[PDB]
Paper text:
The bacterial Tight adherence Secretion System (TadSS) assembles surface pili that drive cell adherence, biofilm formation and bacterial predation. Here we use cryogenic electron microscopy (cryo-EM) to reveal the architecture of the [name] secretin in complex with [name] from [name]. In summary, our study provides a molecular mechanism for how the TadSS secretin [name] assembles and is coupled by its pilotin [name] to the outer membrane.
Data collection and subsequent processing steps showed that most particles fitted a [name] symmetry model whilst a subset (~5%) exhibited C14 symmetry. Working with the [name] symmetry bin, a map at 2.7 Å overall resolution was obtained. A focussed refinement using a mask that enveloped three [name] subunits and three [name] subunits yielded a [name] map (termed TadDFRmap) at ~4 Å resolution which enabled a [name] structure to be built between amino acids 29–212. The resulting RcpAstrep-TadDFLAG complex structure was 188 Å in diameter with [name] forming a classical secretin-like channel decorated by [name] subunits around the outside face. The [name] channel was partially occluded by a central gate with a 31 Å diameter opening formed between the tips of Gate 2. Above the central gate, the inner lip constricted the channel yielding a 62 Å diameter lumen. [name] helices H3, H5, H7, H9 and H11 form the central groove and interface with RcpAaa412–416. Conserved [name] residue R79 is oriented towards and stabilises [name] terminal residue D416, whilst [name] D139 is positioned stabilising the main chain peptide N-H group of [name] S415.
Residue numbers in the entry:
A (entry chain C), C (entry chain A): 131 to 241, 256 to 383, 412 to 416
B (entry chain D), D (entry chain B), E (entry chain a): 28 to 212
The structure:
């Protein structure tokens, strides 16, 4: 045979976690007290004569917001502990004659730039029956952010995972042409200088943020020498003697 | 139908379980299932499969419990295969008939029910079931010789040769065909 | 014969699922309580004196919205579990003389860029009666998003599935020149730190999102050697002896 | 008309059923239909077709039930073919006439009714029905020799030869033509 | 006029019916019409046409019913052709005259009425009608020899030869011309 079917196998697994916490409160009556956590009190200005606040409190968007009005007392709390999981699998296949380039697309085009499953390759069958592959897989998807003033408007970003390399394999052999393991951690703690270290009540004088991420990738290639289905063949389609 | 789905955390795990099952690591698959929650119908039936294949005595009860769930067809089939293992073809044929009825497209069920019938003596029904299994599978490997040996038992040598030509059977399978033809009966 | 009729067969099946859930509530009378799920409470600001809220609640667009006003109590709930199914089939055919290029279009043009069923091919019949095909099928359709400031306005995007390759077949033989299996899963859980883990009531302190997708493709080519209909032929048109 | 349509989940399934029917996998098609809901007119008539072809005894009842539904024409035709299988041409001709009336364009119905008439002796009516079937089909394969053998039974050898020239019949079909001419009568 | 129009679903069907009519598949056209609603004037007249040509006994009634509808001209013409088939030229001439009156431009009606007159003996009127038909048709095929044979019956051999030159008639048509000249009378 002089024609090659190339099977690609792509897998990505990613996990993430997120935590945050902050607290603020106000008191009234004769006296007046306020404790605004970092970035919480920016919405409000107090009048010249100190008789009371002159603004409206806001809310943190990203996390659960709890409020409590208790007459004189007024308090706000933002908290969150969340996790995410993502999984992706793609097994594109493509046939091409020896020495001939081939291309495949399974995504789309936005105002034009392509995305989605892409695959360009060029198999060469050598005199020793080994297969030399020039291969360039891609797996991309839309990510919504940013903007532009030319050639588009409010165009989204792309989350892209691609590889490009050249290898040699025998019929049926396989390679992990690419792989990745990644991990990221970011933390931050803000506290009132003295009160933040109280062993129990200190938590109410602290603000916190935590972001963690992990990821793993695999791209596997497998070339096969193939022949056309016979003229009488039924085409592939989509919707003791015991078995032991 | 089965109105139970597992999350990408504990279903990505059933994928590994299946990999172990078909790897010959039935026992490791049992270990990983034991890690997973007991009472999960999928895990329960997978465990029963492993137990029956490895010779454990609890596969019987596992199949029994799953008879009254969405995992009915495979529970009936498991109990049938147990009866076959014991040699009690009488109830084995009944349970295999029930299983093949409830989920018909299962080639494995049809090919097992045909063998059970052939052992029990319903040669016409055995031919029916073997043909169903052989048609379901893309040409068949066990089904094809399951009908070839039935033909041999029936003596239609030229019809058997017709199938040799059509299926394109090889002597490597003809030897096993005669062996299983002797086995039947 | 020196003329080739090429039959293309394209099939795509895709499935999707979607789930989400969130809850929020408010209470009044002497005391005041609020619990805003992530992104739910951004519409509202509370006054300086803490006598009451000063904004209007909104609704999540994508899912079923249930509300309950019960005097002091006020609650909102967004939930959805939905699934989708899509199927596509295309069987374009095209005739061309040996060594001559041919093209076919069956879609349209928007302000100009083409889309819809497309097919460009170039069949060569070799001295051994085998057919060498240079073929480049496409199946595309409009997808509505994004915008542009030049060469168009509010122009939509395209959902594109295309292939390009070169192969050799005998009269009547077939190839699966391209194929794909894909799967994507995305999940996220947000919870109030301590209350979210209550075995029963925790569900009301959690927000969830799930997106899953699956897909399968096939592109099949089949060349036939053909001859013209006879001069007296009736043209093809569109609207025991027993049969056994 | 038939005011019943099935979803892309259970109709994508009837496509596979049809594939099995024309693949020679009638029994596997029966299995897959059994998977699908019983009482569905389409599934009911498909099952009846399989049952009648494979020799099952329930095809009769399936056709009987479908007589009182939108699946009337094919139910009448099924009962007619059953009568033909039993050799009782008397009621077979009646039922085939009814079926050919209710859905006339069906070439299969016309070619079966013509054979039934030829067996029953209404040679002019048999010629009518055979010509209808042969005209419906794009040149005909069974219809063409169904009228050729009728001509042979009628002795118009030169008219038969006229049809040999027009249809461009081959000796490979002339042998079967004489065989079926002997069959008729 | 005919104030009845059918939709693109059941008129795309009458197109196929016409295709069958002119294909020689009159009987298949009858089948497809039977599929279409009975009582539709178009389907009624088409069915009557098929019935009359194939020899059915109901064409008479079909034409009769359509006499009292917008399908009047062709109903009169059908009854006239029936009378001609029976050989009763007396009423055939009357009905053909009525039909040719109500829809004059129909070349077929004029050429049939001329033949009916020629049979009945109104040679001058037959010449009138044959000339009308021959002028309507673009040179004529049946009309031209319908006037040539009338001339032959009238003995104007040199006028007939004038028409041979003008029409550019061929001996292949001269033979049929003399045959039909013998037929008339």
């Amino acid at each position: 045979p002089n024609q090659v079917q190339t099977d690609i196998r792509f897998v990505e697994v990613s996990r993430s976690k997120l935590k945050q916490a902050s607290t603020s409160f106000v008191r009234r009556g004769g006296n007046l007290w306020v404790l605004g956590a970092p970035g919480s009190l920016g919405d409000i200005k107090v009048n010249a004569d100190g008789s009371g606040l002159g603004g409206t409190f806001g809310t943190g968007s990203s996390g659960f917001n709890l409020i409590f009005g208790g007459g004189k007392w007024l308090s706000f709390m933002n908290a969150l502990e969340g996790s995410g999981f993502a999984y992706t699998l793609a097994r594109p296949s493509l046939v091409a004659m020896s020495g001939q380039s081939a291309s495949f697309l399974a995504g789309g085009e936005f105002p034009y730039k392509e995305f989605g499953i892409r695959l360009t390759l060029t198999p060469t069958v050598m005199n020793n029956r080994r297969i030399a592959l020039k291969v360039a897989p891609e797996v991309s998807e839309l990510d919504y952010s940013a903007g532009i003033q030319s050639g588009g408007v409010a165009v989204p970003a792309l989350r892209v995972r691609r590889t490009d390399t050249s290898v040699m394999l025998a019929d049926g052999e396989s390679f992990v042409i690419s792989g990745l393991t990644s991990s990221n951690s970011v933390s931050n703690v803000d506290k009132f200088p003295w009160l933040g270290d109280i062993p129990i009540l200190g938590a109410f004088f602290r603000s916190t943020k935590l972001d963690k991420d992990d990821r793993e990738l695999l791209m596997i290639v497998t070339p096969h020498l193939v022949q056309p289905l016979a003229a009488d063949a039924q085409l592939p389609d989509l919707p003791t003697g015991l078995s032991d | 139908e089965c109105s139970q789905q597992l999350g990408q955390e504990q279903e990505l795990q059933m994928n590994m379980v299946r990999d172990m099952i078909r790897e010959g690591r039935l026992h490791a698959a049992l270990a990983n299932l034991e890690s997973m929650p007991p009472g999960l119908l999928d895990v329960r039936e997978e465990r029963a499969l492993i137990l029956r294949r490895i010779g454990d005595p609890r596969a019987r009860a596992e199949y029994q419990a799953l008879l009254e769930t969405c995992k009915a067809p495979e529970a009936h089939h498991g109990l049938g295969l147990l009866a076959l293992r014991n040699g009690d073809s009488a109830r084995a044929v009944l349970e295999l008939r029930e299983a093949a009825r409830l989920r018909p497209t299962e080639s494995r069920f049809r090919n097992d029910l045909g063998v059970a019938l052939l052992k029990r003596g319903d040669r016409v029904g055995a031919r029916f079931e073997f043909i169903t299994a052989l048609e379901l599978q893309q040409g068949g490997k066990l089904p094809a010789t399951n009908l070839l040996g039935l033909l041999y038992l029936q003596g239609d040598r030229e019809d058997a040769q017709r199938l040799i030509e059509r299926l394109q059977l090889d002597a490597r399978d003809i030897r096993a065909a005669e062996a299983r033809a002797r086995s039947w009966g």
